Amino acid sequence: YEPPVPTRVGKKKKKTKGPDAASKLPLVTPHTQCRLKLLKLERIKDYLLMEEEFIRNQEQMKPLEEKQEEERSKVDDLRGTPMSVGTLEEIIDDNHAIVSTSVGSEHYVSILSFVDKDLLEPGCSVLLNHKVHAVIGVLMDDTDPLVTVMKVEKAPQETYADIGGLDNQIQEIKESVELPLTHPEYYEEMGIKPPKGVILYGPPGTGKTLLAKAVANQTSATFLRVVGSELIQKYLGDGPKLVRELFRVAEEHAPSIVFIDEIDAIGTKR
Amino acid sequence: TTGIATIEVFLPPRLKKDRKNLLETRLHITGRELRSKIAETFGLQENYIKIVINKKQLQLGKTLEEQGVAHNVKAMVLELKQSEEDARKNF
Amino acid sequence: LEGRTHIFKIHARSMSVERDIRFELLARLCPNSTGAEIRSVCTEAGMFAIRARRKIATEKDFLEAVNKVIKSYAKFSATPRYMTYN
Amino acid sequence: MTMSGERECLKYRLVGSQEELASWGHEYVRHLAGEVAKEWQELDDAEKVQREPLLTLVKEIVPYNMAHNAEHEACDLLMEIEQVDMLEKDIDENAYAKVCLYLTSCVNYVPEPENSALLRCALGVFRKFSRFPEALRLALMLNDMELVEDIFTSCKDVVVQKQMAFMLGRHGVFLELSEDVEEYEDLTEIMSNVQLNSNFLALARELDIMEPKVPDDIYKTHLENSARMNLASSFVNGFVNAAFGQDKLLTDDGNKWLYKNKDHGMLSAAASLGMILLWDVDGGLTQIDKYLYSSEDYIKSGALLACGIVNSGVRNECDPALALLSDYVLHNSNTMRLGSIFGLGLAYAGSNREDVLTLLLPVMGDSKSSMEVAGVTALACGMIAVGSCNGDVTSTILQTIMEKSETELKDTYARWLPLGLGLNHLGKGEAIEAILAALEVVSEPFRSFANTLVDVCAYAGSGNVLKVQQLLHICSEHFDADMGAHQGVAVLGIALIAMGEEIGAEMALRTFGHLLRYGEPTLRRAVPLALALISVSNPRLNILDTLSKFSHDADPEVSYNSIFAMGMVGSGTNNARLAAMLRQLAQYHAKDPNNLFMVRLAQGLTHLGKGTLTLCPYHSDRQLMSQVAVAGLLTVLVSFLDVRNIILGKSHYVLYGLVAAMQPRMLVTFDEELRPLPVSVRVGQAVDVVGQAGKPKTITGFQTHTTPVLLAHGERAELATEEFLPVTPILEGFVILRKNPNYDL
Amino acid sequence: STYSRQIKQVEDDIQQLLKKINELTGIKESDTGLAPPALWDLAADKQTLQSEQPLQVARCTKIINADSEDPKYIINVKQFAKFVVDLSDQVAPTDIEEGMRVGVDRNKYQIHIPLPPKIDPTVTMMQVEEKPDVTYSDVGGCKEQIEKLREVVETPLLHPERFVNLGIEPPKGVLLFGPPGTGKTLCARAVANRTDACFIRVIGSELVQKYVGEGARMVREL
Ligand SMILES: Nc1ncnc2c1ncn2[C@@H]1O[C@H](COP(=O)(O)OP(=O)(O)OP(=O)(O)O)[C@@H](O)[C@H]1O
Ligand SMILES: Nc1ncnc2c1ncn2[C@@H]1O[C@H](COP(=O)(O)OP(=O)(O)OP(=O)(O)O)[C@@H](O)[C@H]1O
Ligand SMILES: [Mg+2]
Ligand SMILES: [Mg+2]
């Protein structure tokens, strides 16, 4: 007996998330309403016409069993109902995986073809057939309550005009969290990456959190707010775990701004 | 002119000489004499050179006019590793 | 000094610097500085040039960057405390 | 201006006051110009006495549009009325670059005859301003040999002529200058690429990659938790060390290694020894000579083909390859023949040399010449006469094709006979109708295969959506193999036509996906070849993932083609991710000799020339098509339509056709005396700069390197400083730099 | 502006065409992890669902009478049960060892396939799959340090033949130390970029766990 050899390189899912999928039409330039943009749009249109005619013909002389709605119905029949929710423990092969159900019992099952195999990573929530436990899908994990806790859903109403006297501070923070997003061409032409991190320090009530609110008002990036004392957890390793998950959520919603307010409170308070 | 041929010859870049160099010789001579004088005229060892005239390999036995050589003809020098007889005897 | 000059060359490679930037002088101006401080000096020189709406960073910009990073930020430097640990 | 204004807004401005147009507004005159074009389309011949004021309106509108940086809007006006000719009259020195750039960007989509019309108009604008390098590029896009000669001899600047000679040598176009022309010697040497080997070796020494690489360093078997194996390893050794002149495995005593291969493997392995000596004719033949005297039938002909591989891409004034290969094209042994014609074709690709073609042509008609030999002869004679529409080659290929029996045409080597024919008329367009009429008399299903092949080769790199529609109609009707052979050619033809411009290629990627999804095996056995052709040396992740999804395909031919396409797509890119995928496939396909051989081939291609070579047929900012590179890629890919019998069979030497497509992804800056000149440059992904006015950046995500740097696909390079002025705007290949008078003022 | 009306007309036509194409082909769902229909091998999926039976993961505990022709294997099926089973006819007796994970059927629980050892998913994700974008050319002033690091962590892997011949056992551990910002993690990223073997990044704070002995378990599984 020989162990199976996967054909996919690595064990992690595809990094790209939430793309245009099959609607990734080529970027036509220039955006100006000129005849060259017109010609590029016509070329895309002719390729779409050819594609449409070809697909219509193929589906026309395809068998009654092999039709888009018929194949979708067959996929539903293959999945069956209900579809159990298990945990992807290991990817043994391209079409074989060890998955653990909610009762803690593991099974060496087969991954069916219609499963999005690039969405499979260890620990991901998978959907399995009720009877044979074969992997029939991958469950799009719902937003964590902690993800909701960090993310600032509505931008604060405090703007830069509501801040008085912090002209230099506003300029310095804009050069690091606002200008790199609105005008990246400055940094690209200068050959430097923007200033990596920014810490606002000063006596209480001076306007550090007010400036952070003003940044959150006029930012196109996801804003995550965390108080330093929130990083102190009740269990060992839960603090590092929370920090790791906070920056994982920051990476998920890129571009993003992570505001670790009152950071010193992690150490000054016991 | 007067039965003397202007043969422009090409030298390998290893011998860092003027690649656009000229040889002058009779045509009654044969490929053996031409090869020997080509080796002498630019400081080369005769045993390890192949000669290319008129986009054809220089047959050594046949004389130049019966070879097909003419005036202002291009020549090419090939450095050889292992002699023809020694390469043939090698295996 | 040689290592700091090398780091300055590494981080200012893609910079739109002037023609006569004395990177050896800049390396001499920050005796005990980590490579991160040198990268920040390059970035802050670029930021000084950008703030003045200039596409090329002069030597004066690098001098102000050294003053801001090596000197002004020296209160927060992790270096003096951490070389006792190493 | 407010309502439709059909034949109205023009009319009152035409009959009313005829004062300066811009006095009535920019928007009003824009609407007036649009209406002018609309009614110009309506007007017939009998209304030629109706355009008297219209010419005045356009002659006043064009300078007005150029005054307010609305040059692109001006361009549409003369484009619609098909009267771009007077544009060159009103071009100023502040806008020639923008108008020429826009017109050139438009040419990829307008069909004939507006194709050549726009091309010649932009060429005239460039010529008026003495922008000789871009004028030469534009003429090369027009394949107008007379115009190439006129542009080359019109310029009085010797340095500009040297840069133009470098461009011509890269493109594979050669000129026979007159001895009266000053600096004839060096110009001819530049155009003949005799110094290409020395420049490449100097680069490699500078880029400290001169050390030879054993195929073990590519396989990396120590990280992994036969005759075919040896032949694959020889191919990897040839590909990785291509054009380097040194190898630890064949440049040493390679007799043990060379005899480690068996049967036709010895054919390729010895021929592989010519790959390391690519472009190094003088030194390469010095190593071929030792194996030229081998008694074994395969070794001598392998060295014969290695001769042509060595001479490929470089034009030697005293033809060595012809001399060494002429005496073996009618040899009694078919293997000595096979090596000789293929080497001669590789050595003189894109030359249209009448002497070589006359020496080679009777070989196809020889009785002793097998079908393999006839196909090889067709491939060669096509490669010499690629895009030339040679009458002799066409006539003899037609004679050979119709002389063969119907059962003889069942052999897949006959598939090479139209290809060379197709190579003869590569990119010519509508010059195949006589050829198609001649092919109509050929029996079927070979007639459909031949017709598809020649038609595609004629419309290669044109983007003609009509021909793509015809090819998709051919692909539509599937047959429950023997009758469906030409479907794979049509699938390859979609790529061969759509490769011209980026939008068409990205659009055709979806069509290739649909062909892989709905198509039959023979239909889907060619989609990987189409993906490789349309994205060669361009390892974009979409095509790589698509090919990976089918690497372990149920159909063995689909698997082989997908693996080879993965290799070709990242060929010469040295892609780390693709190398990891290929290693994983080698582990997965360990017990499958054919799939493992394909994986080794892909690994060898991925590190072609140690990452310093490219197989992409497009240079000069992906606007100039290299006909020799297209011919080599076409040879290999069409031979891959029968990978079971040709590649995996006894005819793997056809892979050396890729030698015709090997060029260095180069940026070497030379002084005015042709010595190397290191300069700081910025290399970054190319950015389209059509439309947006002012000075837009043409590169994004760039880095600063010294000039001896390798440019990836789609990566432009701009001089970082202004100390030097480039002779040509395109910073690819060999570029000459001149000291800027403004710098250090 | 003269082309604007035609621009919008052709753009709307293109959007309608794209929607129409997606109607016949697919691209939908994506919340239940459905692959695009171009990859649906439904007949093979049905054949797999019928022929390929599910296998419960158990752990072999003891082999009784391994010498004779009737060896019985005590398996511990996770949270399910414990059984005394026998190997299937398609598994060699020497392919199953005590203490290794196996996969058995649901009817007679006969051992059907030996399985890889269980590894924590958090440990599995610790291995680097995307190499960093830092080379040794991005580290300045550390010539001797980089050379010493490479001749321990890179050279023995690249060219082991230079070490076995002289009976040489290369060092198997390197500690990079220095003040913050000096380039320790930069050099580690350079190593991970240049390396070809499996590279695993472990942060010390990741080895701190809530429960007793869990960190040692993660180290053992690593
Ligand atoms: N410079 C200022 N201009 C205008 N309003 C200000 C300024 N500084 C503070 N404020 C007001 O004071 C309020 C409270 O200050 P804020 O919470 O921003 O201070 P802080 O420096 O972040 O303090 P802490 O250290 O206590 O977190 C703000 O919401 C804002 O309305
Ligand atoms: N020798 C160096 N050459 C070039 N750049 C350097 C060098 N040392 C540090 N840098 C720069 O400074 C940054 C400091 O980050 P780095 O990961 O190297 O720090 P570190 O030594 O691991 O610090 P810490 O001990 O806080 O983890 C690097 O990302 C790099 O950009
Ligand atoms: Mg606060
Ligand atoms: Mg660190």
Coordinates of N, CA, C and O in Angstrom, one line a residue, chain C residues 14-67:
Chain C
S14 N 15.2 52.4 -4.5 CA 14.2 52.8 -5.4 C 13.7 54.3 -5.1 O 12.8 54.8 -5.8
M15 N 14.3 54.9 -4.2 CA 14.1 56.3 -3.9 C 14.4 57.2 -5.1 O 15.3 57.0 -5.8
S16 N 13.6 58.3 -5.3 CA 13.9 59.3 -6.2 C 14.7 60.4 -5.5 O 14.3 61.6 -5.4
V17 N 15.9 60.0 -5.1 CA 16.9 60.9 -4.4 C 17.6 61.8 -5.4 O 17.5 61.6 -6.6
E18 N 18.3 62.8 -4.8 CA 19.1 63.7 -5.7 C 20.3 63.0 -6.1 O 20.5 61.8 -5.9
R19 N 21.2 63.7 -6.8 CA 22.4 63.1 -7.4 C 23.5 63.0 -6.4 O 24.4 62.1 -6.6
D20 N 23.6 63.8 -5.4 CA 24.8 63.9 -4.6 C 24.4 63.7 -3.1 O 24.8 64.4 -2.2
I21 N 23.6 62.6 -2.9 CA 23.2 62.3 -1.5 C 24.4 61.6 -0.8 O 24.9 60.6 -1.3
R22 N 24.9 62.2 0.3 CA 26.0 61.7 1.0 C 25.5 60.6 2.0 O 25.3 60.9 3.2
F23 N 25.3 59.4 1.5 CA 24.8 58.4 2.4 C 25.8 58.0 3.4 O 25.5 57.5 4.5
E24 N 27.1 58.1 3.1 CA 28.1 57.9 4.1 C 28.0 58.9 5.3 O 28.1 58.5 6.4
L25 N 27.8 60.1 5.0 CA 27.6 61.1 6.0 C 26.3 60.8 6.8 O 26.4 60.9 8.1
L26 N 25.2 60.4 6.2 CA 24.0 60.0 6.9 C 24.3 58.8 7.8 O 23.8 58.8 9.0
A27 N 25.0 57.8 7.4 CA 25.4 56.7 8.2 C 26.3 57.1 9.4 O 26.1 56.6 10.5
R28 N 27.2 58.1 9.2 CA 28.0 58.6 10.2 C 27.1 59.4 11.3 O 27.5 59.5 12.4
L29 N 26.0 60.0 10.8 CA 25.2 60.8 11.7 C 24.3 60.0 12.7 O 23.7 60.6 13.6
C30 N 24.2 58.7 12.5 CA 23.4 57.9 13.4 C 24.3 56.7 13.9 O 24.3 55.6 13.3
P31 N 25.2 56.9 14.9 CA 26.2 55.9 15.2 C 25.6 54.6 15.6 O 25.9 53.6 15.0
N32 N 24.7 54.6 16.6 CA 24.1 53.3 17.1 C 22.6 53.3 16.7 O 21.8 53.8 17.5
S33 N 22.4 52.9 15.5 CA 21.0 52.8 15.0 C 20.7 51.5 14.3 O 21.6 51.0 13.6
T34 N 19.5 51.0 14.5 CA 19.2 49.7 13.9 C 18.8 50.0 12.4 O 18.6 51.1 12.0
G35 N 18.7 48.9 11.6 CA 18.3 49.0 10.3 C 16.9 49.5 10.1 O 16.6 50.2 9.1
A36 N 16.0 49.3 11.1 CA 14.6 49.8 11.0 C 14.7 51.3 11.1 O 13.9 52.0 10.4
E37 N 15.5 51.9 12.0 CA 15.7 53.3 12.0 C 16.1 53.9 10.7 O 15.7 55.0 10.3
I38 N 17.0 53.2 10.0 CA 17.5 53.7 8.7 C 16.4 53.6 7.7 O 16.3 54.6 6.9
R39 N 15.6 52.6 7.7 CA 14.5 52.5 6.8 C 13.5 53.6 7.1 O 13.0 54.3 6.1
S40 N 13.2 53.9 8.4 CA 12.4 55.0 8.7 C 13.0 56.4 8.3 O 12.2 57.3 7.9
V41 N 14.3 56.5 8.4 CA 14.9 57.7 7.9 C 14.7 57.9 6.4 O 14.3 59.0 6.0
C42 N 14.9 56.9 5.6 CA 14.6 57.0 4.2 C 13.1 57.3 3.9 O 12.8 58.2 3.1
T43 N 12.2 56.6 4.6 CA 10.8 56.9 4.4 C 10.4 58.3 4.8 O 9.6 59.0 4.1
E44 N 11.0 58.8 5.9 CA 10.7 60.2 6.4 C 11.3 61.2 5.5 O 10.7 62.3 5.3
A45 N 12.5 60.9 4.9 CA 13.0 61.9 3.9 C 12.1 61.9 2.7 O 11.8 63.0 2.2
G46 N 11.6 60.8 2.2 CA 10.6 60.8 1.1 C 9.4 61.5 1.5 O 8.8 62.2 0.7
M47 N 8.9 61.4 2.8 CA 7.7 62.1 3.2 C 7.9 63.6 3.3 O 7.0 64.3 3.0
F48 N 9.1 64.0 3.7 CA 9.4 65.4 3.7 C 9.4 66.0 2.3 O 8.9 67.1 2.1
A49 N 10.0 65.2 1.4 CA 10.0 65.7 0.0 C 8.5 65.7 -0.6 O 8.2 66.7 -1.3
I50 N 7.7 64.7 -0.2 CA 6.3 64.7 -0.7 C 5.5 65.8 -0.1 O 4.7 66.5 -0.8
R51 N 5.7 66.1 1.2 CA 4.9 67.2 1.8 C 5.2 68.5 1.2 O 4.3 69.4 1.1
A52 N 6.4 68.8 0.7 CA 6.8 70.0 0.0 C 6.4 69.9 -1.5 O 6.8 70.8 -2.2
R53 N 5.6 68.9 -1.9 CA 5.2 68.8 -3.3 C 6.4 68.7 -4.2 O 6.3 69.3 -5.3
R54 N 7.4 68.0 -3.8 CA 8.6 67.8 -4.6 C 8.7 66.3 -5.0 O 8.5 65.4 -4.2
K55 N 9.1 66.0 -6.3 CA 9.2 64.7 -6.7 C 10.6 64.1 -6.5 O 10.8 62.9 -6.7
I56 N 11.5 64.9 -6.0 CA 12.9 64.4 -5.7 C 13.3 64.8 -4.3 O 13.1 66.0 -3.9
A57 N 13.8 63.9 -3.5 CA 14.2 64.1 -2.2 C 15.7 64.6 -2.2 O 16.6 63.8 -2.7
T58 N 16.0 65.7 -1.6 CA 17.3 66.3 -1.6 C 18.0 65.8 -0.3 O 17.5 65.0 0.5
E59 N 19.3 66.1 -0.2 CA 20.1 65.8 1.0 C 19.6 66.4 2.2 O 19.6 65.8 3.3
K60 N 19.0 67.7 2.1 CA 18.4 68.3 3.3 C 17.3 67.5 3.8 O 17.1 67.5 5.0
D61 N 16.5 66.9 2.9 CA 15.4 66.1 3.4 C 15.9 64.9 4.2 O 15.3 64.6 5.3
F62 N 17.0 64.3 3.8 CA 17.5 63.2 4.6 C 18.1 63.7 5.9 O 18.0 63.0 6.9
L63 N 18.6 64.9 5.9 CA 19.1 65.4 7.2 C 18.0 65.7 8.2 O 18.1 65.4 9.4
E64 N 16.9 66.2 7.7 CA 15.7 66.4 8.5 C 15.1 65.1 9.0 O 14.6 65.0 10.1
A65 N 15.2 64.1 8.1 CA 14.7 62.8 8.5 C 15.5 62.2 9.6 O 15.0 61.5 10.5
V66 N 16.9 62.3 9.5 CA 17.8 61.9 10.6 C 17.4 62.6 11.9 O 17.4 62.0 12.9
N67 N 17.2 63.9 11.8 CA 16.9 64.7 13.0 C 15.6 64.2 13.6 O 15.5 64.1 14.8

